């Protein structure tokens, strides 16, 4: 779709689409930018992630509304429309996963980029798992777990415990344990250890880095308060 537009113009337009709250456009611009074949900078990776998180976030919210109505009802219309939204959501997750597999992850050698993309891979398999039913659920769950675990292993070797990507990875992997894997104790353990190890490293940070890390720490604490 975007093959005739310059990479730099796609990135420029993704930033404008964010300002305009046009997240489907933003995601299509950033897909086009990935498909140019070059690696993404830190800022570009964040544009890609913001675009798709907004698109899939709206789909997930709609799927949950429809699934709730369908469960209460238990004609074909509610199920048919939940299925339509579900298929669209799955298609977006498959598109993101396909960008990561062709070829963002394999070309990502620095820890910052490789962890970022593996966290994305865990997230989009987790969104697939949210709507999956049965044994399909099992293999999809294991794919999320494996991506998050590889990201965790790299992050713990290569990043300080306050790094925001390391923190957000741990947060989202703890949500995976709590909400998807039926492992609330593993979720609580991971959130507590992550919080405590970040706290002990705050003294090393500038004022601005302190603000970035403490914001995500508060999200870990907010989950611990809900879970305990």
């Amino acid at each position: 779709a975007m093959g005739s537009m310059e990479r730099a113009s796609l990135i420029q337009k993704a930033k404008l689409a964010e300002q305009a709250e046009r997240y489907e456009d933003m995601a299509a611009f950033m897909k086009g930018a990935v498909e140019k074949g070059e690696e993404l900078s830190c800022e570009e990776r964040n544009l890609l992630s913001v675009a798709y998180k907004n698109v899939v976030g709206g789909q997930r919210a709609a799927w949950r509304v429809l699934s709730s109505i369908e469960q209460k009802s238990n004609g074909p219309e509610v199920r048919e429309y939940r299925e339509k939204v579900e298929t669209e959501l799955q298609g977006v997750c498959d598109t993101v996963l396909g960008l990561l597999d062709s070829h963002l992850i394999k070309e990502a050698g620095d820890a910052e980029s490789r962890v970022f993309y593996l966290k994305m891979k865990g997230d989009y398999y987790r969104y697939l798992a949210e709507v999956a039913t049965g044994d399909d659920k099992k293999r999809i769950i294991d794919s999320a777990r494996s991506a998050y675990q590889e990201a965790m292993d790299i992050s713990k070797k290569e990043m300080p415990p306050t790094n925001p990507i390391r923190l957000g990875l741990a947060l989202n992997f703890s949500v995976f344990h709590y909400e998807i894997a039926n492992s609330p104790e593993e979720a609580i353990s991971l959130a507590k250890t992550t919080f405590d190890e970040a706290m002990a490293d705050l003294h090393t940070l500038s004022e601005d880095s302190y603000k970035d890390s403490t914001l995500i720490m508060q999200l870990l604490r907010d989950n611990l308060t809900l879970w305990t």
């Binding site: 964010e18 800022e43 964040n46 998180k53 907004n54 957000g168 947060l171 989202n172 909400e179």
Partner: peptide, 9 residues
């Protein structure tokens, strides 16, 4: 339970 909102650059 909240994940990273992740919706604003």
């Amino acid at each position: 339970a909240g994940s990273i909102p992740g919706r604003r650059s």
